[PDB]
Amino acid sequence: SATMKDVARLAGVSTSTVSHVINKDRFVSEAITAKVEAAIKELNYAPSALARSLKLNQTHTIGMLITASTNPFYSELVRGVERSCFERGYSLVLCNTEGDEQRMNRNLETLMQKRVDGLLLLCTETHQPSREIMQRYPTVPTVMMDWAPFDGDSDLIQDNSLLGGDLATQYLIDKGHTRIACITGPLDKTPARLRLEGYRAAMKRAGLNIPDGYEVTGDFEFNGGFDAMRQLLSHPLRPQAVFTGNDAMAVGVYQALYQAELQVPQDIAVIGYDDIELASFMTPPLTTIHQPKDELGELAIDVLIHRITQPTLQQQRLQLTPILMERGSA
Template identity: 55%
Template sequence: MATIKDVARLAQVSTSTVSHVLNKTRFVSPEITFRVEQAIDELHYAPSALARSLKSNETRTLGMLVTASANPFFAEVVQGVEQRCFELGYSLALCNTRGDKERLNASMEMLLQKRVDGIILMCTQVRLGAGLFDRYPSVPLVLADWGPMDMEADLIQDGGKQGGRLATEHLIGLGHRHIGCITGPLGKRAADERLAGFKTAMTTAGLPIRPEWIIEGDFELAGGNSAMSALLAQAERPTAVFAGNDMMAMGALRALADAGISVPQQMSLVGYDNIELAHYLVPALTTIEQPKAGLGALTVDTLLARIKAPDSPRRVLTLTPELIVRGSSQTPV
């Protein structure tokens, strides 16, 4: 592998001149610049990323910690993060925590030891290991939507209360008066905010909120399936259900199909996230669009802004959810 000394020898210049041509840190005559560039091409020379990072004190690498899940929502956000990193010339070191706090802390330690320039945290775990950030107090950090709320870090959030309200108002607008809700795991911000939006819409419309029609799920397929089964086992059933995410809505669709209940003729269903699969379900799922690629890109931009201005005030940015109407919801028969 060619070195900067090899380039300097072939171009008949000093290594410092090669460095100035590469980094554009000093004027070099067009003739000498041409010789250096020609030597670089001939030798297929690539500057050492490690050497550059040691010199500039930056690695141009960002770390990301994400809860491993069957939910495609996470994969679509990560895709947005990766795309933005690529556009800006950064690498991404991705770690899955698998919902395990020890794995989370070990991954965080590894990323910090690798001297990443900043970290994106998208995990549902509420607390990191004690003292972890005390040892690295200056690491730039951004929380992406599902991050813990008790950390002094920039936060990008999805506006779950507004989204839950939009979903429920859609069902009310169709004429439904008996509406249930399958929540995510209560105590998690995303689940709590979407449930709060549901309750706000019901209260504003003067409709009763029936506790037995609010079933806690887990944001996964199995949770949505079991929650809908619990609703169907009751003597009185709602005519419409708002599920706190698309994965639970998909599980609920399975339970409805198994029970011989047609959607939306006998029950309307609304999800949340607008994952790509939602469009391909039968019927296609009415849902709340959460701009996942936009969330990923905005998270990267916010982290880089924090890296450049580490002492700036904390930023809390909220994305705007949007209702996507498809075939799983209609006026009650």
């Protein structure tokens, strides 16, 4: 392929001038410009962003780490991120940690080695990035949730899972339910833990007891919700209602109840978390805690770009407001 050097040779000029024509960053005469443009079209010049990135030390690339699965939540989140990147002139490199910590650190190292301009750290997993790696490479603008903790510098977005869990439970309490169970995510994941504590707080505040087996762990996926609900149906004291740690698990709950020939909400009332697209299409439609997903992706990018633009800003800190979407499940 033709380089700016090949262009310059044919137009009989310096590569400096070729750069200036292309970038419009320093005055070049109309004649010279025309010659260069002719040479570009003639040779069919194919610019290398790679080579530009090396010299400029910026790639217009964002790296994103997630802990993804069949949970539709992350699909909507990624959609928002990718769209926002495109609109802002950035590429998206996607990494799935898949729970594994070495995998996560290996992903991170690759991203830093490829000199991404910014980082979305949206892993849920307990682990935090090897500081060895972190402090080896130049610091980059970073956004993370309160999900994954971390010792370095980053802008922060808090999901307020605790208030969400409280709100969800409080809603069931306000509907008059007193036997309320909680299907949670893996308790080593912060959002799962916080939602459980929200549930506990609302129950305690209303003086309602939590039977021994009323808190059950699932995996934040369909199957986890299925398994957990089956277990709950074994309990001596049948729940009137269940708060599931997310919408994915609620899908599994629906399936368990279908198999047990139980109706929602007539036999059991259900409330989820996330308000994924699917929630609205469930039968009955799922009452749930709305959290930003696509919108969250867009917000995280906006934060990240603000910092790229103004590198010396103080730490940015945002919080989401959980909101209840009332439908037919509770």
